[PDB]
Subunit: 298 residues, 4 copies
């Protein structure tokens, strides 16, 4: 019923041992594994994929490679093609169109703090650069340093018909409800935060763009199913409760440091992160390892 | 299942025209009206009841009068008996016990910013001063200037068996979930904020300590019923949506300025607020009036 | 130039060993000591004096006793007579007038979050209740839960001629500068925070309402003197630097828990705090003790 | 007395009418004007220079051109060469060394939220990539989404001898005092905020990295002189007061939208900003224009 589904995994970007090169091979098999484990869609080279330290070429190859890894399946492949420069976002979005990806994810500009009319112009121009490519907006004030308001989000959903979803990680519940109330039900509203998935479902949300779906995709699907389809909020919450420690553990250091460490411990050789992200500490690794054991993953 | 129910109304305190005296008569009939319109419990002389500008005598008379107004019904009467002085809270809690009220509401100390172990000692001593009187804690960092943590709340629920509920208005969803996960299911977790009732239900919440239940109590009951009992989150949300503008309108100036204005417009002569709360402005009254008309309360 | 001077000490309130009674004797000798150690004025029964857990009678006795302890000297005695109830503030301010104290300190209402026009009406009414009694406003959003804006503060300084000072502890530098720019130079602007005294002097401030002046009053006087009178910011900063660890230490737990612990370590038997304030932890006491040793106050 | 002086101007980047090209000519004459009007140093292609929407090539040309515009003067030229990718910052810093600039400005990584030890590794690696290029750190939590602590800043000043200054725009006065107390007096501590210059001087600050020095450089010099040299804080404050409205006006929309509008009103054809920054509103322009008239600038 929604193009990008209920669970979208923000894919980590595997690197070889030194960090210097991407491991496209590990990227393929990891993406294929997610497509058979509850990911309805995958975001490539977004925040969790270390967008900031990838070059544009690396991103374009990752897009091509991940799209081939999941051909055969209903898994949609979304390009993390945003930027705080409209020109750069436009170029990347056009490249995503020519590669035949299923859509893009577009973050609100970070660092340069545009006015609301700037955010709006930024996204119009990007939507216009590939008018037939579905687009998911991404609002994350904690990283960007500004908030896209309800008004701006709603206006964008009306003006550009290829803008069909919003990844809302502000934690602002009123904003989320207002956007939901005023957009058409064909517009998808996704949690950008595993710990907020459940309460955002209560305000009309359609699922989650998740980090934890690398590990518990089918269980996140089951949670959403209990809540939205089967009228069992008590069971949705029983699942949320099983995985709160893991959700906390995945953010005890900045994402994707824990996500990558967890994958390495499960036998997925996704490599280190690139500077400025440093290695997981002994303390954070122990909390993560413990949370994984209690969640039944080791 | 829960002693205080699903919808608890934070009663406004009616005053006569100058503000100098309480109107106990209007208090009685307003409380009777709430008991027959979806209030499972009522809080007397809390924040919404202008606790700060009431004297202790005024509070004690309000308690007595409200308890008689709702005799015959199952509606529980809760004393807003908290303070930032433990000695004062203890005295008021003992008076509530001797008067035969159903419980107390106890705010985290405001203004004086106690440490967590201070908050904990404050509430232990109050629970111990009337060990058979059910108690609802109240966490509201925006007014008090400190936050009662998950750890503190959980520890209090384990130590004192008369502490059976928490009114959580921090808006912190992680805190709320952690408290819920770790307390026994007999422990009630209530939203302290009409706009958060629905999402807190998704994290195991048992309802709301409401301002808006003065006006739409049965509809708030219906929302909670659709969500918890009947498996209809879409309809719960349809109701939340109908009333978001009213919820916004009730806080455009500080509570209870709009609440009292709305009651006056509905024919409830609840009077002004006392200084330092001033009268609602023409601008806030227009936004409130409009929101009430669209919600089907007026004209 | 300014009625309340440059250094105003927010006096702790001594209690006897159980906390149940005030020790008026220790209050007397402590206040006499401050008057001979750079306190130009003393605030009695404010935040640092545990205002919230004192009764009104205890406060009124403290006012009487402290006023007699410093008679003969130019040390001014200020009543912490504020409240979140205008009626209570008015009553206490009238009592302060009849007792012959030198002025009052008046906090922005805490917990009940009045509108700006409410804050303004609250203070007008208090200024009008004793029109000849000098008044110092106190803005502390971290404890009260609201902020008195620059506009409101400036308007109050113009309308009421007995409002002659403001204790600004928002930490907002722009607010502070705007108030200073727009008020007459007879209006005193005081830091409400020992760590902010020096940078607020750079924006035209006239001193500080201090906790640390219990212990280093003459050194705070010297700092202000270097900056304002002698044109030596380098030396003012050398002093600020000497005492930063002590300033940090005095707030590692909520004031006045550390203040009282420091006084006990110096041989001032000021007693415990009252619930909900609990005893200082061994960890905070060690950091405090160490900071005092390095500052040359102890051992 | 310090290498970068007391007033460092964060230079706006002039664009031609469409925004598509830089106007290097206007950049030259604007920089020459600043060097004769109280700028002891100039920062090229930092935040105020629309770093986010400049390409690396545009920045490198701006560096070259600005350096030649001010040859013959004592005005130092600093490259805004930071990034949230350590690799990119390293490459830009090496280019700045080969071009013969006087130093670099290095922002704390934005958007990707590294841990403190990440921030520390980021800056070590950059300092090590050109050990003889003086370096000015830049802490601005409101844009980046994280704060570099006092401990981190102090440790960096001790480890790397080319790290000789800090542009502190957190507005945290305790952090600033602690850094000042613990670093050697050869280490420069600059306000990153025109409205904080004066109170940061009281806590041992050495001046300001300013937007308003485009317009009132000599008056900012006079303020600092009255306070630090001549023992007249009353007169320093009289000057701060004269210019508070202008300081407020310069930030009513995000920098450099007002800065560029002010320059256009003074006859400097600095052009528009690039998306996602949109034009100044009529309302913000009126407040700016009024503040400039009262300050004696038109
Ligand atoms: N690190 C820069 C450019 C990266 C573009 C390709 N991943 C940014 O986050 O804006
Ligand atoms: N102003 C006091 C009044 C004490 C009586 C409480 N009913 C307070 O807000 O706590
Ligand atoms: N506990 C109340 C009453 C204070 C009584 C007078 N000192 C308050 O802080 O306002
Ligand atoms: N727009 C990207 C790269 C710009 C590189 C040169 N200015 C960023 O802000 O990180
Ligand atoms: Ca990307
Ligand atoms: Ca009460
Ligand atoms: Ca008092
Ligand atoms: Ca740059």
């Amino acid at each position: 019923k929604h193009f990008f589904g209920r669970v979208i995994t923000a894919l980590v970007t595997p690197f070889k041992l030194t960090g210097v090169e991407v491991d496209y091979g590990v990227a393929e098999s990891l993406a294929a594994h997610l497509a058979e484990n509850g990911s309805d869609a995958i975001i490539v080279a977004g925040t969790t994929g270390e967008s900031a330290t990838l070059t544009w070429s690396e991103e374009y190859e990752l897009f091509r490679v991940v799209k081939s890894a999941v051909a055969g399946t209903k898994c949609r492949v979304i390009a993390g093609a945003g930027s705080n420069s409209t020109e750069e976002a436009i170029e990347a979005t056009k490249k995503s169109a020519k590669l035949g990806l299923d859509g893009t994810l577009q973050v609100v500009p970070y660092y340069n703090k545009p006015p609301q009319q700037g955010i709006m112009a930024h996204f119009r121009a990007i939507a216009n650069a590939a008018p037939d490519l579905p687009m998911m907006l991404y609002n994350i004030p904690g990283r960007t340093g500004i908030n896209m308001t309800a008004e701006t989000s709603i206006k964008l959903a009306e003006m550009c018909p290829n803008i069909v979803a919003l990844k809302e990680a502000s934690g602002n519940l009123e904003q989320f409800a207002r956007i939901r109330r005023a957009t058409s039900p064909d517009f998808a509203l996704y949690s950008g935060d595993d710990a907020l998935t459940l309460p955002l479902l209560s305000l009309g949300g359609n699922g989650v763009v998740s980090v934890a779906s690398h590990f518990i995709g089918p269980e996140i699907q089951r949670m959403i199913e209990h809540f939205v389809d089967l009228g069992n909020p008590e069971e949705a919450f029983r699942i949320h409760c099983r995985y709160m420690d893991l959700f906390e553990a995945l953010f005890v250091m900045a994402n994707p440091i824990p996500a990558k460490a967890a994958l390495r411990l499960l036998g997925w050789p996704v490599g280190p992160t690139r500077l400025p992200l440093t290695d997981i500490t002994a303390s954070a690794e122990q909390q993560l390892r413990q949370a994984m054991i209690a969640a039944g993953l080791l």
